[PDB]
Amino acid sequence: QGWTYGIQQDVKNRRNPRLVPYTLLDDRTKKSNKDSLREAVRTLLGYGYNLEAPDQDHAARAEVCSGTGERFRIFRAEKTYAVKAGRWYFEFETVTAGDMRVGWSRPGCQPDQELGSDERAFAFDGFKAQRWHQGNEHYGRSWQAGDVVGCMVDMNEHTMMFTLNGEILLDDSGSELAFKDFDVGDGFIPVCSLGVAQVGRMNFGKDVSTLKYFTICGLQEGYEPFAVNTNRDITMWLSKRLPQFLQVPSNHEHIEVTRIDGTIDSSPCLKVTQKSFGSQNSNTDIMFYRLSMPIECAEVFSKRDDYDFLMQTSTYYYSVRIFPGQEPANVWVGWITSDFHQYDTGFDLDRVRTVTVTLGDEKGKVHESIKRSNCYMVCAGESMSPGQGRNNNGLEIGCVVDAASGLLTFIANGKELSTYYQVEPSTKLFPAVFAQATSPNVFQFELGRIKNVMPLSAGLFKSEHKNPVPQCPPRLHVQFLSHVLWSRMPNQFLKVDVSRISERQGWLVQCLDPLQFMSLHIPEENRSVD
Amino acid sequence: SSKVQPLMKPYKLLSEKEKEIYRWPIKESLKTMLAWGWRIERTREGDSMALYNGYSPRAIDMSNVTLSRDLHAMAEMMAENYHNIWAKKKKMELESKGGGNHPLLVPYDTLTAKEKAKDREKAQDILK
Amino acid sequence: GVEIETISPGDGRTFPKKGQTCVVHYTGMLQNGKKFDSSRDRNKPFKFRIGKQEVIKGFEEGAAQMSLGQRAKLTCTPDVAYGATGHPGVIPPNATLIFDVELLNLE
Amino acid sequence: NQHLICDNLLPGRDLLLQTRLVNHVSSMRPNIFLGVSEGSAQYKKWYYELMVDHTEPFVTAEATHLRVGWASTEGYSPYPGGGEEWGGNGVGDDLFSYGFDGLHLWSGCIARTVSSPNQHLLRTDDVISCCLDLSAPSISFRINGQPVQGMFENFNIDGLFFPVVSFSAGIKVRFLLGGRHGEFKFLPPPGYAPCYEAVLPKEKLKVEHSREYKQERTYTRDLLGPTVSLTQAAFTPIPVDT
Numbered sequence A: 001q002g003w004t005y006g007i008q009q010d011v012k013n014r015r016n017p018r019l020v021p022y023t024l025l026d027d028r029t030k031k032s033n034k035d036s037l038r039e040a041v042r043t044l045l046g047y048g049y050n051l052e053a054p055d056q057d058h059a060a061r062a063e064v065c066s067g068t069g070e071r072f073r074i075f076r077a078e079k080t081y082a083v084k085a086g087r088w089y090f091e092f093e094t095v096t097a098g099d100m101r102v103g104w105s106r107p108g109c110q111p112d113q114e115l116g117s118d119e120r121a122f123a124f125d126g127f128k129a130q131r132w133h134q135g136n137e138h139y140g141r142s143w144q145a146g147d148v149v150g151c152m153v154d155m156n157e158h159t160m161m162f163t164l165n166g167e168i169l170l171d172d173s174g175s176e177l178a179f180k181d182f183d184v185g186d187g188f189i190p191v192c193s194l195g196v197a198q199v200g201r202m203n204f205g206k207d208v209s210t211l212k213y214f215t216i217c218g219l220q221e222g223y224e225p226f227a228v229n230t231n232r233d234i235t236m237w238l239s240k241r242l243p244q245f246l247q248v249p250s251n252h253e254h255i256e257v258t259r260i261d262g263t264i265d266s267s268p269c270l271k272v273t274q275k276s277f278g279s280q281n282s283n284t285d286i287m288f289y290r291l292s293m294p295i296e297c298a299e300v301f302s303k304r305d306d307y308d309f310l311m312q313t314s315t316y317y318y319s320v321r322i323f324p325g326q327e328p329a330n331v332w333v334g335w336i337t338s339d340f341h342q343y344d345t346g347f348d349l350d351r352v353r354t355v356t357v358t359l360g361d362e363k364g365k366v367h368e369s370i371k372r373s374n375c376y377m378v379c380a381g382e383s384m385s386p387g388q389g390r391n392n393n394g395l396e397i398g399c400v401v402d403a404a405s406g407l408l409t410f411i412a413n414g415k416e417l418s419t420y421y422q423v424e425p426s427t428k429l430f431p432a433v434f435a436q437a438t439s440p441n442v443f444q445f446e447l448g449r450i451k452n453v454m455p456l457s458a459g460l461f462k463s464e465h466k467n468p469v470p471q472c473p474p475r476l477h478v479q480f481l482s483h484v485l486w487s488r489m490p491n492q493f494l495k496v497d498v499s500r501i502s503e504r505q506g507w508l509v510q511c512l513d514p515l516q517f518m519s520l521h522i523p524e525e526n527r528s529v530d
Numbered sequence B: 001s002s003k004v005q006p007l008m009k010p011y012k013l014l015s016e017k018e019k020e021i022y023r024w025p026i027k028e029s030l031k032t033m034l035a036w037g038w039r040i041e042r043t044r045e046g047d048s049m050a051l052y053n054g055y056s057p058r059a060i061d062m063s064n065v066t067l068s069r070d071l072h073a074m075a076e077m078m079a080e081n082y083h084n085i086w087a088k089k090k091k092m093e094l095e096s097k098g099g100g101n102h103p104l105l106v107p108y109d110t111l112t113a114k115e116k117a118k119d120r121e122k123a124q125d126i127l128k
Numbered sequence C: 001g002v003e004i005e006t007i008s009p010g011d012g013r014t015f016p017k018k019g020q021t022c023v024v025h026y027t028g029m030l031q032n033g034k035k036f037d038s039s040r041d042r043n044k045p046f047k048f049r050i051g052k053q054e055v056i057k058g059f060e061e062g063a064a065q066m067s068l069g070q071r072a073k074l075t076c077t078p079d080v081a082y083g084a085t086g087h088p089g090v091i092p093p094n095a096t097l098i099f100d101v102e103l104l105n106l107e
Numbered sequence D: 001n002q003h004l005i006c007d008n009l010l011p012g013r014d015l016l017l018q019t020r021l022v023n024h025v026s027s028m029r030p031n032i033f034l035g036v037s038e039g040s041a042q043y044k045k046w047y048y049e050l051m052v053d054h055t056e057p058f059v060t061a062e063a064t065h066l067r068v069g070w071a072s073t074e075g076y077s078p079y080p081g082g083g084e085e086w087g088g089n090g091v092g093d094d095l096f097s098y099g100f101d102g103l104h105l106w107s108g109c110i111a112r113t114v115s116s117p118n119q120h121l122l123r124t125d126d127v128i129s130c131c132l133d134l135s136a137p138s139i140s141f142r143i144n145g146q147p148v149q150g151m152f153e154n155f156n157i158d159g160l161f162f163p164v165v166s167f168s169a170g171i172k173v174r175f176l177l178g179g180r181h182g183e184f185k186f187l188p189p190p191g192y193a194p195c196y197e198a199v200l201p202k203e204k205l206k207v208e209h210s211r212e213y214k215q216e217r218t219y220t221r222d223l224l225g226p227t228v229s230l231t232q233a234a235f236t237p238i239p240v241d242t
């Protein structure tokens, strides 16, 4: 009918406040229709027809409704605080009982790995009374809401013990120690992992009075607060929520980048292969690859090939060869900006972030309308027209960028595609490829040229600006979007005061204390860090 | 004698009798995968591709494409049936020669990885 | 060769006249957005006598067209800002300079 | 050699890592979580208004940050997608947020100069009207009652939008959310509804930090894990087949 939910009832705009889920439905209508249908059903029973209610089939969604694949957030102190000797103690407060882990982590713990699933952590899982180090063994009790977990380590004897509300937790047997055989290594750092909708609190012990069970269990034993002698609040690092682009590690489980030297009859190439494809534990997801160095457009847009045209042109080129056997529909070739941070298991060209900034004159006529995005790509599957055997030559999706006009043109197997983009001046575009590895050999980064177009290195490197010979200097390397990074919680935030003045005045926001940080900018990546 | 043959003309130029010997394997593969009740379907893209469609060397790289888990297991016993047909022919040969156990008369599972190579390339080749 | 966005309006009534010291409080950034100069960083109002070849062409004309108490953005093309030689170690050759200028006082 | 290395390395600012002193920028948003979806009960036109009571142009050597507009989340999570939890990033420094500073339209960390009667940066006693149209994706602004000659349009509509203001130190701003949460100083455009009508019947409207972590005592800081998607923010009636 066209009605809409609202906070009040207005028939003129077709807005009924009752348009809410039945769980949130108002009590009077809920009880009225409840008792009406109750009487109807119970009279239906009274007419002999016996209504057998089906059994309540138990179902569970595992309470996993977080952002994409994120399922926990790891909080740890800075790596420089790692302890290699002595006895230490810190408290973990469980605001909400649930899937939460706390313990000591080596200064190499990956932010995207469960605490204790590997050798880099020694955690206590009180949700299921588990002890985590390369595996789960039954240990201790299970906490409740408000319970305080006391984590204490003794590096002299290489032992760890845990306390729940002052009571020492034990193994399956009466053993007090939870972990008792480990090397010092690089030290240990307090760490906690929090599940979905889980709230926790760390008390490193900067103020001993704030500790709740240190004197109950941990003072006379010789253990010391982790921040007993510190003069500053301990910097705490938490797992980064926003994926970033970083170079493919040489020890990566799946990705394997091979640099191919350009011969006389060939061009420099960056072949991307998957190490563990076809074996059990193989990873089948969209891996987002880009090139470490961008192409910057002109500050002001202008309004047998000839060496002079090649010298005076500002057009650059790079090709991607989808290997014969890899699914073209799973490969996207194009350009991205530094703003691309969208890691989704299912990628399509229609869900990319975009916006059209329309600027008009006073009368309202649109004198210019500019479209903005961070992902200018094409899909190889739709790009490739002929079909069938692609084995005559690997699918070459040539990408042409006009750094003087901002026009992005794509050429596939010698024919120009209809898809094109128009970026703004001074836009920095990173050659990027998104591909799902359906084959050990996925794609390639051929850095050759076409007629009358400069190579990619000519725009990437200022020294090679007038060099028509394609090159692949070591600074240009294949990167990929990953979640294995840490983020530094600031030691001090802005002092913001919020309070509603009155009904007619509204909500007041007041910030007056100046706070500043000096940031470090990476020129080749167009990003800044503290 | 000189290892020269005229049989590398294009298939369209080959004679019809020379053609049966290539699809006898294809016909047998079709019979193998239809005797098990499998319904093979033709999608929209394949139908459209059909509606569109010495010599220059154009080599079909039939080595990089990889096959799904279920289809691989499916091809496992379908390659088993190829070995099974091989055992039929060599059992006829056994009956003709009146004895003498062949080294690979053993069931499919008793062969090793490098004894089982034919059934591989043929089986997942046609499935690829 | 320099146009002007006003950022904060001035009085609009008094403009620098000849031989008068102009006190400005500026911040100069390159086209890409990288800062290279700021009087606010040094915490010191910048003084120069107008029409007298003390500062660059573009800054001179922008301050001239400025009004008292105004805040404005100045865009200086290379021809009126350091030319094709540039400023050694600071300004690259053929660089457009963008200035955030405020005319505090005229003296 | 000292002169050559400097003149050949420093001016480029493309090899050595660059340093800059940046003001911290924080964001505040109400409890509103509005979005558009097929076969669901949400009003596609919303309107709120912001007032500036005080703003020092230069608290420090850097220009004071003050941006207002709309922001969207990634998916149906209550987390503003595609942004930093701290730093000098505000409304419009990503493709998930759209901002107005009195002189530019900010989106994706790129600013476009926008025309307006008596253009000026946001000052004291300036009233900004923000209008969001989700039927045809459109965001428009009105400064001191006069229309702003610019519009965001054709942006992604797959998440929850909310009013948002970003700022550095040295502001005094007031949210005028309509109804009993601040009376509008200008009439909403015809069709647009006040933002206080999107509040849930049990929940109460309040202006909170856009991000989870604030300035408070360290041992009392509440560490938050992943949050649950707001699947109840979009009431889509899907009855069983009959």
Ligand SMILES: Nc1ncnc2c1ncn2[C@@H]1O[C@H](COP(=O)(O)OP(=O)(O)OP(=O)(O)O)[C@@H](O)[C@H]1O
Binding pocket: A009, A011
């Ligand atoms: N017997 C009934 N008569 C009328 N409405 C009913 C009845 N039973 C249920 N309803 C529901 O109650 C609502 C009636 O709201 P309606 O807009 O008519 O009333 P109102 O805004 O309170 O003012 P008024 O008293 O003038 O009708 C509708 O959602 C309708 O479906």
